Amino acid sequence: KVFERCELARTLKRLGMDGYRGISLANWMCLAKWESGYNTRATNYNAGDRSTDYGIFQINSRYWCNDGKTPGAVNACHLSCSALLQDNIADAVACAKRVVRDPQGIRAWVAWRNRCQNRDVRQYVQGCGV
Numbered sequence: 790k791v792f793e794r795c796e797l798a799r800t801l802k803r804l805g806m807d808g809y810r811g812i813s814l815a816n817w818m819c820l821a822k823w824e825s826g827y828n829t830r831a832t833n834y835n836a837g838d839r840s841t842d843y844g845i846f847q848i849n850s851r852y853w854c855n856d857g858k859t860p861g862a863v864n865a866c867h868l869s870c871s872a873l874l875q876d877n878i879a880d881a882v883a884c885a886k887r888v889v890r891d892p893q894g895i896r897a898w899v900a901w902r903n904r905c906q907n908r909d910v911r912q913y914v915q916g917c918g919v
Contacts, residue, residue, distance in 0.1 A: 791829075797827050798814060825846070844881050846884075
């Protein structure tokens with residue numbers, strides 16, 4: 790599904806993302822916006838290294854989920870990558886939280902560095918009741 794902005798903001802807040810490991814809701818919204826346009830069903834193949842990015846946060850199969858076809862990959866979220874293509878984002882949120890328990894935190898996604906870091910991200914949550 791493609792979430793509407795404020796519905797996603799409230800969905801993420803009910804899932805415990807506001808301030809998780811120091812990360813505001815607006816930062817998670819900016820991440821989802823630029824990774825996927827708030828789209829849970831998206832996959833993007835990376836031909837350079839044979840990995841694939843999955844779902845609303847475009848989480849990569851080399852370290853985070855298992856798709857069976859990424860050579861030498863691991864599965865730190867202990868999920869099939871299929872779980873990251875559901876309309877229900879609970880599993881994707883659990884995996885995003887796993888990502889940010891590692892040292893880089895939200896910097897693990899380069900799109901966040903490019904499109905969210907050191908920026909005014911307040912617009913993403915404006916009016917949403919979060």
